[PDB]
Amino acid sequence: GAMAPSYRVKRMDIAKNDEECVVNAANPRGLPGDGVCKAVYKKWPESFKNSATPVGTAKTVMCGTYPVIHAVGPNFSNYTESEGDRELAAAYREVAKEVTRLGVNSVAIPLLSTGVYSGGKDRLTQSLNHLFTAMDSTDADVVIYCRDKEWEKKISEAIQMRT
Ligand SMILES: [Cl-]
Ligand SMILES: [Cl-]
Ligand SMILES: [Cl-]
């Protein structure tokens, strides 16, 4: 575990993370995809061997000795608000189980279902709160990656609000 388990946020490409493993915002089919998923495919393409997994789950595949945890959030274009919320919570719970199993001291994680799976809504608070519900009981250092300056400020404020 980390000596003083923490949450942090950085505004940069998660493919350039400084953590012991990465969470991919995957599609269920293990396809290269776009956004975070395409960056992850370019950096760790070996991790997409048999990475297909259903919505609400996470599947880890090693790239060398570096673990890539493929976490499949719901596409809110297809799910109801109610069912989508349940599957988004479940995907983060499966990430917490994998991070624990791997014995890593740190993990890089994007906000699931906030980009092309958002169904055109702002889901920063929804997705971040499900991330906290899952990861709070883990002792890995968690580093959240985002691309937008306003999102960085809101995620940083939400972390600091608990501290
Ligand atoms: Cl960058
Ligand atoms: Cl997304
Ligand atoms: Cl962002």
Side-chain angles (χ1 to χ4, degrees), residues 25 74 111-118:
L111 293 186
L112 302 176
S113 300
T114 63
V116 299
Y117 277 15
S118 70

Side-chain angles (χ1 to χ4, degrees), residues 14 17-24 44 60-62 65-69 95 98-100 102-110 135 140-143 145:
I14 199 172
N17 76 78
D18 195 24
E19 287 72 58
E20 291 182 0
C21 69
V22 69
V23 176
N24 185 25
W44 306 282
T60 300
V61 180
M62 306 306 298
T65 74
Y66 188 80
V68 178
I69 305 170
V95 166
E98 284 298 277
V99 165
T100 300
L102 290 163
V104 295
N105 291 334
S106 64
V107 55
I109 193 168
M135 301 305 294
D141 282 336
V142 171
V143 184
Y145 286 75

Side-chain angles (χ1 to χ4, degrees), residues 146-148 151:
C146 68
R147 291 313 283 270
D148 180 274
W151 278 41

Side-chain angles (χ1 to χ4, degrees), residues 32-90:
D34 318 70
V36 166
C37 188
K38 176 49 67 51
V40 165
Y41 182 71
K42 287 193 188 163
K43 185 54 69 178
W44 306 282
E46 301 91 337
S47 74
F48 290 67
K49 188 187 181 219
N50 294 309
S51 64
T53 197
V55 173
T57 77
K59 184 165 194 182
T60 300
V61 180
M62 306 306 298
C63 175
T65 74
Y66 188 80
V68 178
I69 305 170
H70 299 271
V72 184
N75 178 4
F76 278 98
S77 291
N78 294 334
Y79 284 90
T80 61
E81 290 292 342
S82 174
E83 198 73 352
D85 184 72
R86 184 185 66 63
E87 288 296 5
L88 178 55

